[PDB]
């Protein structure tokens, strides 16, 4: 959430660069700056990718277990 | 608290393109004047081929002896 | 070349002054649209994100 | 790149909005100082595994919501963060098979 808000505020400050002094050095920094921010917003959510991976194994196992018991109960009724 | 990678914006109004550049550059009265010199020079002379050759030389870029060697008759 | 056309060169002065004002008009207009767009963006973000744009208007 | 025209700009608008999208948002979740391996360091117990299997845990087993409706990881959440007719549709987090 911090990096989302930082991306938007640095876009507004880049608009302030384009309003006040377009020939400044800072815009090059600014056109680098939010790039670094965008990298981090990808780099955090890639860190959800192992977790998601591990978590899908967990729910698969739960569904696996449930289906076994369901067939057992189905068969026993028969 | 502070957002990531905040910095200082430049000086409040430095030289921009949003100013009136002409009035800052002292060129206002010339424009207020301005807003043929063939005709303005034909105020002095008669009118305004080889003049095409004059413009082409423009696009390209012993006096007593001449008066002595200028022998030609009248009629 | 304008002398070759037989006009005044004063017309060339007028045209250089006019092109200077044309470029200055275009650049001031682009900067003015950026001003209006920044104002609209901070209005809409202050609508959707209250506290963040509050802290931004504090820091400026 | 050179020219943007009414029709092409409106094409950009509908494509970007179809990619992206009274409150009906998720219930906010605070920071969590007890985390199980690093933070609180619980010796492997049993209440935590029974909570992760059977009960409702809103940070771990699903996403809760205002108007009460619970959504676990395999379901898709329909919400409306704006005051419009356009509805955000969060896709499932797991997508089993």
Short mmCIF file of C-alpha atoms in Angstrom, two decimals:
data_model
loop_
_atom_site.label_atom_id
_atom_site.label_comp_id
_atom_site.label_asym_id
_atom_site.label_seq_id
_atom_site.Cartn_x
_atom_site.Cartn_y
_atom_site.Cartn_z
CA UNK A 1 0.00 0.00 0.00
CA UNK A 2 2.93 2.31 0.75
CA UNK A 3 4.45 1.61 -2.65
CA UNK A 4 1.13 2.22 -4.40
CA UNK A 5 0.79 5.59 -2.73
CA UNK A 6 4.44 6.40 -3.38
CA UNK A 7 3.98 5.64 -7.09
CA UNK A 8 1.04 8.01 -7.31
CA UNK A 9 2.74 10.81 -5.38
CA UNK A 10 5.89 10.52 -7.46
CA UNK A 11 3.75 10.78 -10.57
CA UNK A 12 2.31 13.99 -9.14
CA UNK A 13 5.81 15.26 -8.40
CA UNK A 14 6.83 14.43 -11.95
CA UNK A 15 3.91 16.58 -13.03
CA UNK A 16 5.36 19.29 -10.79
CA UNK A 17 8.69 18.86 -12.58
CA UNK A 18 6.96 19.24 -15.94
CA UNK A 19 5.14 22.33 -14.70
CA UNK A 20 8.02 24.15 -13.01
CA UNK A 21 11.39 23.28 -14.56
CA UNK A 22 11.43 20.73 -17.40
CA UNK A 23 15.12 21.23 -17.96
CA UNK A 24 16.01 20.18 -14.43
CA UNK A 25 18.33 17.30 -13.67
CA UNK A 26 15.76 15.82 -11.27
CA UNK A 27 13.36 14.56 -13.94
CA UNK A 28 15.99 12.07 -15.07
CA UNK A 29 16.17 10.97 -11.45
CA UNK A 30 12.37 11.11 -11.39
CA UNK A 31 12.11 9.04 -14.55
CA UNK A 32 14.44 6.64 -12.84
CA UNK A 33 12.78 7.05 -9.45
CA UNK A 34 9.32 5.66 -10.02
CA UNK A 35 10.94 2.95 -12.15
CA UNK A 36 12.61 1.69 -9.00
CA UNK A 37 9.25 1.93 -7.27
CA UNK A 38 7.61 -0.13 -9.98
CA UNK A 39 10.33 -2.74 -9.65
CA UNK A 40 9.59 -3.13 -5.97
CA UNK A 41 5.86 -3.45 -6.58
CA UNK A 42 6.61 -6.37 -8.81
CA UNK A 43 9.27 -7.73 -6.53
CA UNK A 44 6.99 -7.93 -3.53
CA UNK A 45 4.18 -9.72 -5.31
CA UNK A 46 6.54 -12.22 -6.84
CA UNK A 47 7.25 -13.09 -3.23
CA UNK A 48 3.63 -14.17 -3.00
CA UNK A 49 4.32 -16.71 -5.70
CA UNK A 50 6.05 -19.45 -3.67
CA UNK A 51 3.47 -18.97 -0.94
CA UNK A 52 0.58 -19.27 -3.41
CA UNK A 53 2.32 -22.35 -4.78
CA UNK A 54 2.62 -23.94 -1.36
CA UNK A 55 -0.90 -22.95 -0.52
CA UNK A 56 -2.42 -24.54 -3.58
CA UNK A 57 -0.82 -27.81 -2.54
CA UNK A 58 -2.53 -27.45 0.82
CA UNK A 59 -5.99 -26.95 -0.57
CA UNK A 60 -5.46 -29.70 -3.09
CA UNK A 61 -4.64 -32.06 -0.25
CA UNK A 62 -7.76 -30.99 1.64
CA UNK A 63 -9.93 -31.53 -1.40
CA UNK A 64 -8.18 -34.84 -1.98
CA UNK A 65 -8.94 -35.98 1.55
CA UNK A 66 -12.56 -34.91 1.35
CA UNK A 67 -13.16 -36.68 -1.92
CA UNK A 68 -11.78 -39.94 -0.54
CA UNK A 69 -14.15 -39.83 2.41
CA UNK A 70 -17.07 -38.93 0.18
CA UNK A 71 -16.49 -41.95 -2.02
CA UNK A 72 -16.12 -44.09 1.08
CA UNK A 73 -19.44 -42.88 2.43
CA UNK A 74 -21.07 -43.22 -0.98
CA UNK A 75 -19.88 -46.77 -1.32
CA UNK A 76 -20.92 -47.70 2.19
CA UNK A 77 -24.44 -46.48 1.56
CA UNK A 78 -24.56 -48.64 -1.56
CA UNK B 1 4.64 8.30 7.39
CA UNK B 2 6.74 9.79 4.62
CA UNK B 3 6.19 8.19 1.26
CA UNK B 4 9.04 6.33 -0.37
CA UNK B 5 11.42 8.50 -2.40
CA UNK B 6 9.98 11.93 -1.84
CA UNK B 7 12.31 14.77 -2.76
CA UNK B 8 12.44 18.51 -3.17
CA UNK B 9 10.62 20.11 -6.07
CA UNK B 10 12.53 22.84 -7.94
CA UNK B 11 12.48 26.59 -7.29
CA UNK B 12 8.89 27.88 -7.36
CA UNK B 13 9.01 29.84 -10.65
CA UNK B 14 12.30 29.63 -12.51
CA UNK B 15 12.53 30.18 -16.26
CA UNK B 16 9.69 28.31 -17.96
CA UNK B 17 7.71 28.40 -21.13
CA UNK B 18 4.68 29.64 -19.22
CA UNK B 19 6.03 33.17 -18.85
CA UNK B 20 5.60 35.84 -21.50
CA UNK B 21 9.01 35.30 -23.04
CA UNK B 22 8.89 38.36 -25.30
CA UNK B 23 8.02 40.92 -22.62
CA UNK B 24 10.67 39.41 -20.39
CA UNK B 25 13.10 39.59 -23.31
CA UNK B 26 12.35 43.30 -23.89
CA UNK B 27 10.96 42.75 -27.40
CA UNK B 28 7.42 43.99 -26.77
CA UNK B 29 7.52 47.41 -28.43
CA UNK B 30 8.94 46.02 -31.67
CA UNK B 31 6.04 43.58 -31.87
CA UNK B 32 3.51 46.29 -31.03
CA UNK B 33 5.02 48.26 -33.88
CA UNK B 34 4.91 45.32 -36.24
CA UNK B 35 1.54 43.70 -35.54
CA UNK B 36 7.21 46.62 -49.49
CA UNK B 37 10.66 47.99 -48.79
CA UNK B 38 10.83 47.62 -52.52
CA UNK B 39 8.04 50.21 -52.35
CA UNK B 40 9.61 52.03 -49.38
CA UNK B 41 12.84 52.28 -51.39
CA UNK B 42 10.92 53.20 -54.56
CA UNK B 43 10.01 56.19 -52.45
CA UNK B 44 13.60 57.11 -53.41
CA UNK B 45 14.01 55.47 -56.84
CA UNK B 46 12.05 54.58 -59.95
CA UNK B 47 10.93 50.95 -59.67
CA UNK B 48 11.67 47.73 -57.80
CA UNK B 49 16.44 38.48 -65.36
CA UNK B 50 19.69 40.16 -64.38
CA UNK B 51 18.01 41.21 -61.13
CA UNK B 52 17.33 37.49 -60.85
CA UNK B 53 21.10 37.22 -61.34
CA UNK B 54 21.47 39.74 -58.51
CA UNK B 55 19.41 37.51 -56.24
CA UNK B 56 21.37 34.49 -57.49
CA UNK B 57 24.66 36.16 -56.58
CA UNK B 58 23.02 36.86 -53.22
CA UNK B 59 22.16 33.16 -52.99
CA UNK B 60 25.73 32.33 -54.01
CA UNK B 61 27.33 34.41 -51.25
CA UNK B 62 41.93 51.25 -61.29
CA UNK B 63 38.96 53.60 -61.42
CA UNK B 64 40.91 56.18 -63.41
CA UNK B 65 42.02 53.29 -65.62
CA UNK B 66 38.37 52.40 -66.28
CA UNK B 67 37.52 56.04 -67.05
CA UNK B 68 40.51 56.21 -69.42
CA UNK B 69 39.67 52.90 -71.12
CA UNK B 70 35.94 53.76 -71.36
CA UNK B 71 36.35 55.29 -74.84
CA UNK B 72 33.08 55.33 -76.77
CA UNK B 73 31.50 57.94 -79.02
CA UNK B 74 28.24 59.82 -78.55
CA UNK B 75 26.01 59.14 -81.57
CA UNK C 1 15.25 35.45 -50.54
CA UNK C 2 12.42 37.73 -49.38
CA UNK C 3 14.28 40.61 -51.04
CA UNK C 4 14.23 38.42 -54.16
CA UNK C 5 10.48 38.24 -53.70
CA UNK C 6 10.54 42.05 -53.52
CA UNK C 7 8.78 42.56 -50.20
CA UNK C 8 9.94 44.26 -47.15
CA UNK C 9 12.35 42.34 -44.94
CA UNK C 10 10.18 43.93 -42.26
CA UNK C 11 7.73 41.19 -43.23
CA UNK C 12 10.42 38.68 -42.29
CA UNK C 13 10.78 40.43 -38.93
CA UNK C 14 7.01 40.20 -38.48
CA UNK C 15 7.06 36.52 -39.33
CA UNK C 16 9.90 35.73 -36.92
CA UNK C 17 8.04 37.59 -34.17
CA UNK C 18 4.84 35.71 -35.05
CA UNK C 19 6.58 32.33 -34.92
CA UNK C 20 8.09 33.26 -31.56
CA UNK C 21 4.62 34.03 -30.22
CA UNK C 22 3.22 30.87 -31.83
CA UNK C 23 5.76 28.67 -30.06
CA UNK C 24 5.20 30.54 -26.80
CA UNK C 25 1.44 30.12 -27.11
CA UNK C 26 1.74 26.38 -27.78
CA UNK C 27 4.13 25.79 -24.89
CA UNK C 28 2.05 27.82 -22.42
CA UNK C 29 -1.01 25.87 -23.52
CA UNK C 30 0.63 22.50 -22.93
CA UNK C 31 1.78 23.61 -19.49
CA UNK C 32 -1.72 24.91 -18.75
CA UNK C 33 -3.31 21.56 -19.63
CA UNK C 34 -0.79 19.86 -17.36
CA UNK C 35 -1.84 22.27 -14.61
CA UNK C 36 -5.52 21.43 -15.07
CA UNK C 37 -4.74 17.72 -15.19
CA UNK C 38 -2.73 17.82 -11.97
CA UNK C 39 -5.57 19.69 -10.27
CA UNK C 40 -8.15 17.15 -11.48
CA UNK C 41 -5.96 14.24 -10.41
CA UNK C 42 -5.48 15.55 -6.89
CA UNK C 43 -9.22 16.24 -6.66
CA UNK C 44 -10.14 12.70 -7.65
CA UNK C 45 -7.45 11.06 -5.53
CA UNK C 46 -8.54 13.17 -2.57
CA UNK C 47 -12.01 11.80 -3.19
CA UNK C 48 -10.87 8.19 -3.31
CA UNK C 49 -7.87 8.31 -0.91
CA UNK C 50 -8.67 10.82 1.83
CA UNK C 51 -5.83 10.36 4.32
CA UNK C 52 -3.03 9.98 1.79
CA UNK C 53 -3.87 13.12 -0.16
CA UNK C 54 -4.34 14.88 3.16
CA UNK C 55 -0.76 14.01 4.12
CA UNK C 56 0.38 15.01 0.63
CA UNK C 57 -1.30 18.42 0.88
CA UNK C 58 0.42 18.74 4.25
CA UNK C 59 3.86 17.92 2.87
CA UNK C 60 3.27 19.60 -0.54
CA UNK D 1 2.62 6.94 -30.91
CA UNK D 2 2.57 9.89 -33.38
CA UNK D 3 -1.22 10.54 -33.26
CA UNK D 4 -4.07 9.67 -30.84
CA UNK D 5 -7.65 10.17 -32.18
CA UNK D 6 -11.14 10.16 -30.53
CA UNK D 7 -11.90 6.57 -31.61
CA UNK D 8 -8.43 5.24 -30.76
CA UNK D 9 -8.40 7.07 -27.42
CA UNK D 10 -11.80 5.59 -26.58
CA UNK D 11 -10.46 2.17 -27.57
CA UNK D 12 -7.64 2.73 -25.05
CA UNK D 13 -10.29 3.66 -22.48
CA UNK D 14 -12.47 0.55 -22.87
CA UNK D 15 -9.46 -1.79 -23.05
CA UNK D 16 -7.88 -0.35 -19.89
CA UNK D 17 -11.16 -0.43 -17.98
CA UNK D 18 -11.95 -3.99 -19.04
CA UNK D 19 -8.49 -5.06 -17.91
CA UNK D 20 -8.80 -3.28 -14.56
CA UNK D 21 -12.49 -3.45 -13.61
CA UNK D 22 -22.41 1.89 0.30
CA UNK D 23 -18.93 0.40 0.09
CA UNK D 24 -18.84 -3.44 0.02
CA UNK D 25 -15.12 -3.78 0.56
CA UNK D 26 -13.23 -6.39 2.49
CA UNK D 27 -13.05 -5.95 6.23
CA UNK D 28 -9.72 -4.33 7.00
CA UNK D 29 -7.04 -6.51 8.57
CA UNK D 30 -4.54 -4.93 10.97
CA UNK D 31 -0.87 -5.69 11.31
CA UNK D 32 -0.08 -9.08 12.77
CA UNK D 33 2.58 -9.28 15.51
CA UNK D 34 1.85 -13.00 16.24
CA UNK D 35 3.22 -14.96 13.31
CA UNK D 36 3.77 -18.62 13.79
CA UNK D 37 7.30 -19.49 12.85
CA UNK D 38 9.18 -16.12 13.23
CA UNK D 39 7.08 -13.78 15.33
CA UNK D 40 5.32 -15.56 18.16
CA UNK D 41 7.32 -18.82 17.67
CA UNK D 42 4.68 -21.35 18.72
CA UNK D 43 6.21 -24.81 19.28
CA UNK D 44 4.25 -26.96 16.77
CA UNK D 45 0.90 -27.30 18.60
CA UNK D 46 -2.58 -28.27 17.41
CA UNK D 47 -5.05 -25.41 17.91
CA UNK D 48 -3.48 -23.58 14.96
CA UNK D 49 -3.83 -26.55 12.62
CA UNK D 50 -7.41 -27.13 13.71
CA UNK D 51 -8.14 -23.46 13.08
CA UNK D 52 -6.50 -23.62 9.66
CA UNK D 53 -8.58 -26.65 8.74
CA UNK D 54 -12.04 -26.14 10.20
CA UNK D 55 -12.69 -22.63 11.49
CA UNK D 56 -12.78 -19.24 9.79
CA UNK D 57 -9.44 -17.47 9.80
CA UNK D 58 -9.61 -14.25 7.80
CA UNK D 59 -5.95 -13.86 6.96
CA UNK D 60 -5.14 -17.47 6.25
CA UNK D 61 -8.14 -19.49 5.08
CA UNK D 62 -10.09 -16.83 3.25
CA UNK D 63 -11.06 -13.23 2.68
CA UNK D 64 -13.91 -11.88 4.77
CA UNK D 65 -16.22 -9.09 3.71
CA UNK D 66 -18.77 -6.48 4.65
CA UNK D 67 -22.34 -7.78 4.29
CA UNK D 68 -20.87 -10.85 6.01
CA UNK D 69 -20.19 -13.23 3.13
CA UNK D 70 -17.11 -15.42 3.59
CA UNK D 71 -14.92 -16.39 0.64
CA UNK D 72 -12.15 -18.94 0.86
CA UNK D 73 -9.23 -19.10 -1.52
CA UNK D 74 -10.81 -21.11 -4.29
CA UNK D 75 -13.71 -18.73 -4.83
CA UNK D 76 -14.06 -15.53 -6.83
CA UNK D 77 -15.08 -12.36 -5.02
CA UNK D 78 -17.45 -9.83 -6.56
CA UNK D 79 -17.18 -6.34 -5.07
CA UNK D 80 -17.87 -2.71 -5.96
CA UNK D 81 -15.24 -0.32 -4.56
CA UNK D 82 -16.68 2.64 -6.44
CA UNK D 83 -20.13 4.16 -6.39
CA UNK D 84 -20.78 2.96 -9.94
CA UNK D 85 -22.38 -0.02 -11.64
CA UNK D 86 -18.95 -1.38 -12.54
CA UNK D 87 -18.03 -4.29 -10.30
CA UNK D 88 -14.55 -5.43 -9.39
CA UNK D 89 -14.18 -9.17 -9.79
CA UNK D 90 -11.28 -10.62 -7.86
CA UNK D 91 -10.45 -13.96 -9.42
CA UNK D 92 -9.74 -17.04 -7.25
CA UNK D 93 -6.39 -17.15 -5.52
CA UNK D 94 -5.77 -20.85 -6.02
CA UNK D 95 -7.75 -22.06 -9.08
CA UNK D 96 -7.79 -25.78 -8.32
CA UNK D 97 -7.56 -27.69 -11.63
#
